[PDB]
């Protein structure tokens, strides 16, 4: 086989600077579509009010530097590229608790990144219900480096993605909904997404 896959890569990352936002015009914000997918609830530590989860952080955005006509490159329309090479919006889980997988890049600039993660975030037993088999657990995600001027978050679904979720014997997910906030400290606006989990038993 003969791969102009190597030519596209050399042409795509020639003078690429992963630290410059890959916008066309410098006035532009980069829109990052975001969604949380849960694989399983690993453990609910009722003592320390903590929760550990296995999740994927679904991210998608446009990198206007990484755009090509497939006709020039043997009809390639998509390629897999290491996340370490790309500009990233640097979305993190806020209350410290995102492995560097590879990214998919498409000839129109769309980048799809879904890195897996394992987190231990804080919980809160619901005292309104007796017996006490409810817990309120929140996960808050947003860019660390870029304010809303430079990265805007778009929440792709009101619900956490659970199609591939593993029900663990000991707790059940009553609800898991995401909502957008735009609140952070300083003379800067920072958009974020809060996911609220209601766990039973
Ligand atoms: C690029 O093409 C894909 C289909 O492969 C599509 O899902 C995506 O919306 C396109 N990107 C843009 C920025 O239109
Ligand atoms: C816990 O979550 C439930 C469901 O969203 C809500 O009705 C309740 O007000 C919350 N209370 C606390 C203390 O978290």
Author numbering: 1 to 97, 104 to 207
What does the published report state?
Nicotinic acetylcholine receptors (nAChRs) belong to the superfamily of pentameric ligand gated ion channels that are widely expressed in the neuromuscular junction (muscle type), in the central and peripheral neurons as well as in other tissues (neuronal types), and are naturally activated by the neurotransmitter acetylcholine (ACh). The β3 subunit of nicotinic acetylcholine receptors (nAChRs) participates in heteropentameric assemblies with some α and other β neuronal subunits forming a plethora of various subtypes, differing in their electrophysiological and pharmacological properties. While β3 has for several years been considered an accessory subunit without direct participation in the formation of functional binding sites, recent electrophysiology data have disputed this notion and indicated the presence of a functional (+) side on the extracellular domain (ECD) of β3.
The human β3 ECD was expressed in the yeast Pichia pastoris and after enzymatic deglycosylation, the obtained crystals yielded a 2.4 Å resolution structure of its monomeric state. As shown, the structure of β3 ECD adopts overall the same structural architecture that has been presented previously for homologous proteins. Its main secondary structure elements comprise the N-terminal α-helix and a ten-stranded β-sandwich core, from which several putatively functionally important loops (loops A–F) emerge. Two N-acetylglucosamine (GlcNAC) residues were clearly detected in the electron density maps, modifying predicted glycosylated asparagine residues, one at a highly conserved glycosylation site located at the C-terminal side of the Cys-loop and another at loop β5–β6. However, as the crystal structure of β3 ECD shows, another arginine, originating this time from loop C, β3-Arg190, not present in β2 and β4, nor in α subunits, spatially places its guanidine group approximately at the same position as the guanidine group of the β2-Arg149. This in turn induces breakage of the already deficient aromatic box, slightly reorientating the rotamer of loop A Phe94 to create a distorted sandwich cation–pi assembly with Tyr196 for the guanidine group of Arg190. As Arg190 resides in the post β9-strand region, loop C adopts a previously unobserved trajectory with its lower and upper parts obtaining a closed-like conformation and its middle part (tip of loop C) being in an intermediate conformation (closed-in compared to β2 and more open compared to the agonist-bound α4 subunit).
